[PDB]
Amino acid sequence: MVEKIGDVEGFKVIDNGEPTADIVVGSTAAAADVVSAANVAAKVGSMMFKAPLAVLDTEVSLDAANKKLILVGGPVANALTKELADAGKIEMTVESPATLAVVAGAANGNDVLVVAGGDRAATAEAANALIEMLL
Amino acid sequence: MVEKIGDVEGFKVIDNGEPTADIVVGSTAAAADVVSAANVAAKVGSMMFKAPLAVLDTEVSLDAANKKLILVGGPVANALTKELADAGKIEMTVESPATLAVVAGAANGNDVLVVAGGDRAATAEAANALIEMLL
């Protein structure tokens, strides 16, 4: 199910005990993808030996990010994921499976982790896979 | 802003290092309320010295809950919050402020913490107040 594109295992969400990424939720999306986001945020907090960890895709841009971005939701869900799709950084449709996709430096030099699939279910599977990998 | 109804300070979300509540997200709602939910889940995870901590309001009922429920979203957002509103346990409208409302035993004997306000902003304020209180 879960396609690991890029070096996902190398994507660090914690450095010491301080989070290295925002969790960007699709504002134009289902409450499911962001249930995923909440579970991911729970995982990160668990690993947190500042600011809202979770934000909306209307409150962050790739060009202005000062840290890594975990995009939760596909192009139909997350505006930033769509921006990445409208630029060939990611190719994702309704037919796309659960996907953890690292785009290097897509956010103002900082790496991006797209956690998304074709539908809500696939996004949730990808989030769950990320949680399993973080342990 | 944040109305503390009931004994909110006494609402324990962690017992030792294992979460005592679900975080129930309004499926029929804004991605903002559940950005709140994700931030709350981050807080809980931080305090976590099993299952998805965050769920949707379509995946849990009050009558079947086996633990505390943190409802995120007002009656317009969270189906369980509406059920509580359609029963006088909570009274919440567009005019309602940011609110942390403990309903004792509303979920099959387990207590419920409504984290919600009149609009998205108020829900987020209530979530932030809960986070500050948990520390």
Numbering used by the authors:
A (entry chain A), B (entry chain A): 23 to 71, 492 to 577
Can you quote the paper on this entry?
Cell surface layers (S-layers) form symmetrical lattices on many bacterial and archaeal cells, playing essential roles such as facilitating cell adhesion, evading the immune system, and protecting against environmental stress. The S-layer is built from one or more (glyco)-protein subunits, S-layer proteins (SLPs), that self-assemble into a highly flexible and dynamic lattice through an entropy-driven process, allowing for structural adaptation in response to changing environmental conditions. In this study, we introduce the SymProFold pipeline, which utilizes the high accuracy of AlphaFold-Multimer predictions to derive symmetrical assemblies from protein sequences, specifically focusing on two-dimensional S-layer arrays and spherical viral capsids. The predicted models were validated using available experimental data at the cellular level, and additional crystal structures were obtained to confirm the symmetry and interfaces of several SymProFold assemblies.
High-resolution experimental data confirming the proposed assemblies at the atomic level is very scarce. Based on our predicted models of Viridibacillus arvi and Methanococcus voltae, we designed constructs (see Methods section) containing only the domain responsible for the formation of either the 4-fold or 2-fold axis. H Proposed assembly of Methanococcus voltae (gray) with the 2-fold symmetry axis of the anchoring region is shown in orange. Aligning the crystal structures with the SymProFold models revealed a great similarity, with RMSD values of 0.65 Å for V. arvi and 1.38 Å for M. voltae, further confirming our predicted assemblies. The SymProFold prediction of S-layers from P. abyssi, M. voltae, T. camini, T. thioreducens, and M. vannielii, even though different in sequence, size, and domain structure, show an analog domain arrangement as the crystal structure of M. acetivorans SLP and reveal a dimeric anchor, which has not been described previously. For S-layers from Vibrio aerogenes, Paenibacillus naphtalenovorans, Pyrococcus abyssi, Methanococcus voltae, Thermococcus camini, Thermococcus thioreducens, and Phocaeicola vulgatus, no experimental data on the unit cell parameters, structure, or symmetry are reported.
